[PDB]
């Protein structure tokens, strides 16, 4: 116990403080867990079951009674404290809760719980982190080691040196709850075993260019970051990649009411550069500005003006020239005039014409375009036909909507090809072998007022978790397949499947909104009216909407592993269009500047070519989806699962509703539950004798006469030949008979 | 707790809450089909249109009204009719309000009997209650006593009252009313 340096308390207790601590009384009958209403589950005692009454008996003074319905066992004291959360003898939602909080407060982060590694952050520093832990790992391995970040980082490498194939790492938590410092640790201990400082360099211009305040997080990652760790043949640090994947476009047009745009128009709006803003004619009031006055103006998230400066001082150490910041901040500026833009009817016709042309000249002087031929470009595209061209009519909706998709096309093109220049500054000529990558997610979040943004990002997570839980599917048949026992060969994937089939199916919400768009006259009536005479009833999880403790709204409630969730119609059909406008286009691709190179060509024997008109923000990202996961399913993957202990920067004390929210989005209880379908409770025979031999003192024949002496049915328990499989009853059968034999 | 109030008459259902000094939904008491074969795939055109929406889509429904005189003839188009009144107009649950009910003097049995057992049945209201429609004239007149002529829209009728006490053998009942005035107009 030597071995881990000062670090050892905190990294794992003592065997003989664990004995210490394990002589203590506990009432397995009447100190149950029990529903609360300040918290979910409280630790109380009962007094007796009478009939319906009983009475839990708190640490608070409290003397409530709950129903005889809603009562489950608390975990046994010589399990408590379990390193890996998949052993613990009773498998409940508050039990394991209760254990991180338990282990939290004994200032032990790390927990093991089957597949998955949950670490809770300190608030403290800790010489967990020292190297001495580090280059003193190398050597024990993951069976045995207790839980750390460091175990499952170097599980990954040896696998890829084996297996000779990539890996993958699932850092899953929220923006500011320490997942870019556990994954500045993993690139250190990455780099320890054999370019982090470039990474953490270059990351501002990330947090810049995607990064928008949302309710529950002020610096919120939209974009899927996702860092490709290369490495060579002998196994040592060659070079590293990186992608983005599913930037979210409707944050650039469109906000809610409680969050704002991209931190980066607001770094501009700070004032603290003020030939930006004389060079871009960018007047200082935000609400001047129709993309971004809609979300929420200004808050207290960070110093936006010091903000501004770090990435100005990360752009002039990246390879890039001022210059080339120079336009990026003007192309920035341009995307912000193109909402104020005004057009109107035509005097006697169906066609829309602009009124106000100043914006519209000063756009295209930054853009540079001409503003009458750009003018033109909005009003009458051009298409062909055949062999010729021929002027299309548009109105005042299409033209909007066409400035709206170019907006966000011109903005994700910018990010696409800086993240293109970033990694060609990382680049290393160094031979690239077998990768192991670093993912950085959205997660499962729910609000009240759910929207079109929150149902991609769930259905994103959906395709995560179901990828995850087939996986571990797998991983049980080969633990299965080692121990010779085989049984109940149904899979896990498919009982999330059929909440996707809603989704992304032909007739399923996507596609009925696609449909809905094209439509002629649909409204979000209509919308609501064809989702349910499509789906109520006729599917298994969609349903209803609920009105709860008065809720603003909701008009269909979908079902996914993270629970119930209510979703609103309004505004999706207006929102959903990207009708890109391709004569527009070409003049990009005309441009005299560097925008032509970012649209450098954008839009017969068999042609899969959609139409301009005929996108869709669900169509592009269900395409994304689908090359991330092709991405992904190549690779062994590992998960990590990050979870913030209260929302306040005091340590020790916690929130269980916030450590239940993140349980419940994160799906530790989905992968726990996976487990509670087979016997979770695996133990060898060897301890089993040496801890239950004192029931029946006298290896299967000794095990089969204690356990025939024990009155265990048959399918209770699973028969191994290196272990014998238990489920909770059966553990908690044995403990009271022991508890009786002394 | 609050009551429902509703007047179904017939040409114009009228409904509310007690204690309200006008009624909060008033629409014509039809029911609507469509009489054409529909094109548009897509439009995910519905079946029936009741109450006001269907008095927009004149030109391509044919309308019928599911109270003929007083009596009801088309029980599935009142259901409809009703269904729509409480989820629709009113939107409220039924299930905790108790519901008047009213209808003209001297009609058939069976519709009343009928009336209950859909209210309780179907919509599973906690209590309810029918009324004639000229007692509650003569309440909303601040009257006690006088003879009311009640001329609706498929029946009209006199109802004396003296002192609060009816007197039935001099109920009169005429079935000339606004329906057969609009057909002799037509
Ligand atoms: N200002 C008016 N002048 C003449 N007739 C009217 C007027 N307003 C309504 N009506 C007639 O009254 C009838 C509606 O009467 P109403 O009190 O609604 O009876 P019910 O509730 O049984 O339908 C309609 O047929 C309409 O033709």
Redesign the interface.
Known sequence: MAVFGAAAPYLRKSEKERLEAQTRPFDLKKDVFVPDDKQEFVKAKIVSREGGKVTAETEYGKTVTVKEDQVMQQNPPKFDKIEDMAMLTFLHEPAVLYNLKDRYGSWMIYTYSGLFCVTVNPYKWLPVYTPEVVAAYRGKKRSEAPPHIFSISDNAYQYMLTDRENQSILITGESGAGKTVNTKRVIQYFAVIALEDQIIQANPALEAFGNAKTVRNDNSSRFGKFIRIHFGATGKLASADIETYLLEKSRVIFQLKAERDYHIFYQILSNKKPELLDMLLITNNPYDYAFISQGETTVASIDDAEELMATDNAFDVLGFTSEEKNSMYKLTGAIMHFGNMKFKLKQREEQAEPDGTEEADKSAYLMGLNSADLLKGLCHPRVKVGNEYVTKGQNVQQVIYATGALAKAVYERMFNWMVTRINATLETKQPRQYFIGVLDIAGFEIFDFNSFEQLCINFTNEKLQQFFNHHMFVLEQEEYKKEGIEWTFIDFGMDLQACIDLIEKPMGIMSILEEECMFPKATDMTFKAKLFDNHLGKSANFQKPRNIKGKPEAHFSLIHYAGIVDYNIIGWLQKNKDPLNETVVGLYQKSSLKLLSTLFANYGKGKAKKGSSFQTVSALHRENLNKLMTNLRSTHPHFVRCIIPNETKSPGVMDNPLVMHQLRCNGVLEGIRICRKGFPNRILYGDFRQRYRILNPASRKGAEKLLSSLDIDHNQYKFGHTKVFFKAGLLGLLEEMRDERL | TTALVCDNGSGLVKAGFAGDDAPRAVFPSIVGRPRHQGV?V???Q?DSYVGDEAQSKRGILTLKYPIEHGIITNWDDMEKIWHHTFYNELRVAPEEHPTLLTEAPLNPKANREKMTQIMFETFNVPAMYVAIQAVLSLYASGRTTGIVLDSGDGVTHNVPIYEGYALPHAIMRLDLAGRDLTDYLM
Do not use: A, I, P, S
Request: net charge positive; proline share 0%; glycine share 40%.
């Open positions: 548009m897509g439009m995910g519905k």
